[PDB]
Design a protein around this ligand. Structure first.
Ligand SMILES: Oc1c(Cl)c(Cl)c(Cl)c(Cl)c1Cl
Ligand SMILES: Oc1c(Cl)c(Cl)c(Cl)c(Cl)c1Cl
Ligand SMILES: Oc1c(Cl)c(Cl)c(Cl)c(Cl)c1Cl
Ligand SMILES: Oc1c(Cl)c(Cl)c(Cl)c(Cl)c1Cl
Lengths: 217, 218
C-alpha cells in the first residue's frame, strides 16, 4: 500500500457527528500524502456492526460501541462529557437550568439505542427523569438536533465538543446538565481479519495521530 | 380519533438529514400552540423499500423526493428546489472564474443518495459522470455532514439552494452557480393509502401543506 499513489476508498462508520469530527482532520494527510485516497463516511445501521467490519464493507468504526469486542480490536482516542445547549433567545436563559426548570422546558432528544452506540446511555438517563410531554422532537442525527436547537426553543443534551463547535458559531449557549451522566470513551474499532492489512494499518495510524482538542489542519 | 390539543401521539417522518432540519423547526410553532404534547420524530432514510415502512405504519409521512414511491402511495407536492455550489471563503479558487473545467479540477465532497433512493441521486449521477474520479475526496450520505466539512476544508459541495443559503448566512461558505444544467427538484410529502383517512395523519399532512417553506420557522 502506497499512500502517494493509492486510489483506495476507505469507509468509516460513524455517527453524523463522528463523520464531521473525523473527515476534516484527515484532509491534510490526504492532500499532502495520499492525493487519490477517498474517505467515505458511513451512517450507523440497526444491524450488527461487527459483521460489517468483518466483510470489509467498513474499514474502521469510530465512536463508542460497547457491544464490540468479539473478533474486534480497539484503540481509545479520547473521552467526552455532556452538556446542554439552548439558544440565547430561550426564556430559560435568565434563571438557568436547575433540574426542575429543565423538566418544564421542551426537549429534542438524539436517539441511539437502535444504532447501539454509547449515546444510548445518555438517552436512557434523560428519558427516566423527563416527563414524556417535555420531549418535543426526536432524531437520530446529532447535527440535525443542533440546528433544530438553533432555530427553536428546545433544550439539547450533547457531547461537549459538538456543543462548543456550534456555540462558537451560533446563538447556542452552554449549560451543565442537571442530571448525572457517564463519561464517554471514544475509540476506533477494526476487525482482526484486517489487523495486518497495510491499508487499514496506515489509516488507523493516521487517526491515532490526530489531535482531537485542536482544530483541523 | 385525534385531537391535537390533547394527543400525545409521536409522529414519525422519514426524511434526509436535510429534510428533517427543514421540516421540524417549521412544525415547532404549530405544536407549541395547538398540540403541546404531540411528538415529532425525524427518521433517517434506509436501503429498504420506503413504501413498506409507509404501509405498515412504522412511518407516517415521507418528506422529500422519492421517485420510486408510486403504487399504493399518495403524494402532495410542496415546492421546487434548484441546485447551487458552495465552497468556503478561504478557498483559493474563490478568486478566478469557476467554469466547467475549473470545477472538474477542484476537490469535491459528494452526498451519496442512490443507496437510499432519493431524488438527490440524479445529481449524484451527473457528478460521478462529470468529474475525474481523483477530484472526489470525500463521500457522505448526510447533507449537514457535507456542509460542515466544506466549511472546514477546501472541497466543493453541490447541494439544494435552501441548504446553501442557511449555511451561507454563517459566512464561511460562498455560493456560486453550478456550471452545468441540473434537474429542477420537486419536493413532496408522501403517505400510504391505508392511512389516507386516519385523522392524525390527515392532520399532520394539512399542517405540512400549510407550511411556508420560502420563509423561516414561525
Ligand atoms: O458517534 C459519537 C461520537 Cl464520534 C462521539 Cl465523539 C460521541 Cl461523544 C458520541 Cl456520544 C457519539 Cl454517539
Ligand atoms: O471539530 C468539529 C468539526 Cl471539524 C466539525 Cl466540521 C463539526 Cl460539525 C464539529 Cl461538531 C466539530 Cl466538534
Ligand atoms: O431530502 C431532500 C429534500 Cl427535503 C430536499 Cl428539499 C431536496 Cl431539494 C433534496 Cl435533493 C433532498 Cl434529497
Ligand atoms: O430552513 C432551514 C433550517 Cl430551519 C435549518 Cl435548521 C437548516 Cl440546518 C437548514 Cl439547511 C434550512 Cl434550509
Amino acid at each position: 500500500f502506497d499512500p502517494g499513489t493509492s486510489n483506495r476508498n476507505f469507509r468509516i462508520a460513524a455517527s453524523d457527528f463522528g463523520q464531521a469530527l473525523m473527515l476534516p482532520r484527515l484532509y491534510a494527510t490526504l492532500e499532502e500524502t495520499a492525493p487519490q485516497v477517498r474517505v467515505t463516511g458511513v451512517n450507523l445501521r440497526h444491524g450488527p456492526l461487527v459483521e460489517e467490519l468483518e466483510s470489509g464493507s467498513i474499514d474502521i468504526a469510530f465512536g463508542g460501541f460497547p457491544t464490540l469486542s468479539a473478533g474486534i480490536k480497539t484503540q481509545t482516542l479520547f473521552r467526552e462529557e455532556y452538556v446542554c445547549v439552548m439558544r440565547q433567545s430561550h426564556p430559560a436563559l435568565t434563571h438557568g437550568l436547575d433540574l426542575e426548570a429543565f423538566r418544564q422546558c421542551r426537549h429534542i432528544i438524539v436517539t441511539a439505542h437502535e444504532f447501539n452506540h454509547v449515546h444510548e446511555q445518555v438517552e436512557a438517563r434523560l428519558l427516566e427523569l423527563l416527563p414524556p410531554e417535555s420531549i418535543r422532537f426526536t432524531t437520530e442525527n446529532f447535527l440535525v438536533s443542533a440546528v433544530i436547537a438553533e432555530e427553536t426553543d428546545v433544550i439539547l443534551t450533547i457531547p461537549s465538543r459538538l456543543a462548543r463547535w456550534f456555540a462558537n458559531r451560533g446563538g447556542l449557549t452552554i449549560f451543565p446538565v442537571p442530571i448525572e451522566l457517564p463519561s464517554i470513551e471514544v475509540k476506533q474499532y477494526w476487525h482482526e481479519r484486517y489487523d495486518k492489512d497495510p491499508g487499514n494499518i496506515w489509516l488507523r495510524r493516521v487517526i491515532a495521530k490526530i489531535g482531537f482538542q485542536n482544530p483541523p489542519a
